[PDB]
Design an enzyme around this catalytic site. Structure first.
Site, PDB file in Angstrom:
ATOM      1  N   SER A  46       0.828  -1.227   0.000  1.00 35.25           N
ATOM      2  CA  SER A  46       0.000   0.000   0.000  1.00 35.25           C
ATOM      3  C   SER A  46       0.856   1.268   0.000  1.00 35.25           C
ATOM      4  O   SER A  46       0.267   2.362  -0.158  1.00 35.25           O
ATOM      5  CB  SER A  46      -0.950   0.023   1.184  1.00 35.25           C
ATOM      6  OG  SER A  46      -1.760  -1.158   1.266  1.00 35.25           O
ATOM      7  N   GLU A 144      -3.841  -7.049  -6.483  1.00 38.44           N
ATOM      8  CA  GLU A 144      -2.905  -8.030  -7.103  1.00 38.44           C
ATOM      9  C   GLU A 144      -1.445  -7.615  -6.906  1.00 38.44           C
ATOM     10  O   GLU A 144      -0.591  -8.492  -6.941  1.00 38.44           O
ATOM     11  CB  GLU A 144      -3.243  -8.183  -8.588  1.00 38.44           C
ATOM     12  CG  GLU A 144      -4.598  -8.799  -8.859  1.00 38.44           C
ATOM     13  CD  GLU A 144      -5.776  -7.858  -8.698  1.00 38.44           C
ATOM     14  OE1 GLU A 144      -5.574  -6.633  -8.785  1.00 38.44           O
ATOM     15  OE2 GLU A 144      -6.890  -8.356  -8.476  1.00 38.44           O
TER      16      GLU A 144
END
Length: 266
Positions: A46, A144
């Site tokens: 992230s 993904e």
């Protein structure tokens, strides 16, 4: 100086962790750096969302009204861990609100919608090249990009490239003054990093950070700008990975590595 006395403690930490730890820390006062595996690739997870928000702000400099542009999205945009985007499903959200959600809550739907606005992972990679980052690559979308397969260069950067790009965006001239302060304010309001670099820092020092947690291969990270009381800011990145898919990441290891990096700049 203490710069070349962190290798042994970092080795001990990554051996207790059961993996690899990558650190780069920069004293913007002296220009002094602490380096450990700082040029190895680690998955961004992230952590790319901070640079995503920076790219939106860079584009807002030459495009009035970008940040207030409404984005209307369907249930099809919602992916796991979209805690803000979920609540505005019926109303939509501005580019600015999606950027804030991506930085401060690691909102996946928000990140994917913003990636679409910037021309996908290729578009964010091009932005990073435009500020002189030749290491960063985003290849895939959420979720993904989190596969974090050992030796797979997809969706990775180096602790050093992360730190250098973070410095240019938060303290250098890559963003105009209002955009720069907005990026800093988004990082300062992050809610996901209290157990990482923030835990290595005295409570009265200002900190902005973005976290990453792949959920596999003990792969997690944090980068931060730190403003020590009355002193030049410090920029640092802490990345971890481990060789087995079910190896657990550790927030405590990231905090301990941040403590070593800061002590190393003494």
């Amino acid at each position: 100086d203490l710069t070349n006395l962190v290798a042994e403690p970092f080795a001990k930490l990554e051996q207790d962790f059961g993996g690899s730890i990558g650190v780069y820390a920069m004293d913007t006062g002296s220009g002094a750096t602490v380096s450990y595996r700082a040029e190895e690739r680690f998955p961004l997870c992230s952590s790319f969302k901070g640079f995503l928000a920076a790219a939106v702000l860079a584009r807002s400099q030459q495009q009035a009204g970008l940040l207030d542009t409404p984005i209307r999205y369907g249930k099809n945009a919602l992916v796991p861990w979209s805690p803000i985007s979920e609540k505005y499903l019926t109303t939509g959200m501005t580019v600015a609100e999606l950027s804030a959600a991506a930085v401060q809550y690691s909102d996946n739907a928000a990140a994917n919608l913003l990636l679409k606005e910037l021309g996908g992972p290729a578009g964010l990679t091009a932005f990073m090249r435009s500020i002189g980052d030749t290491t960063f690559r985003l290849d895939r979308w959420e979720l993904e990009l989190n596969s974090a397969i050992p030796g797979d260069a997809r969706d990775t950067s180096s602790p050093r490239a992360v730190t250098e790009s973070l410095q240019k965006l938060t303290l250098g001239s890559a963003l105009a003054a209002p955009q720069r302060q907005q990026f800093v304010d988004w990082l300062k309001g992050n809610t996901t990093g209290n157990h990482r670099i923030r835990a290595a820092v005295p409570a009265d020092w200002a900190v902005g950070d973005k976290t990453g947690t792949c959920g596999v291969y003990g792969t997690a990270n944090d980068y931060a700008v730190v403003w020590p009381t009355g002193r030049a800011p410090i920029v640092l990145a802490v990345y971890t990975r481990a060789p087995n898919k079910d190896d657990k990441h550790s927030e405590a290891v990231i905090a301990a590595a941040a403590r070593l990096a800061l002590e190393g700049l003494g």
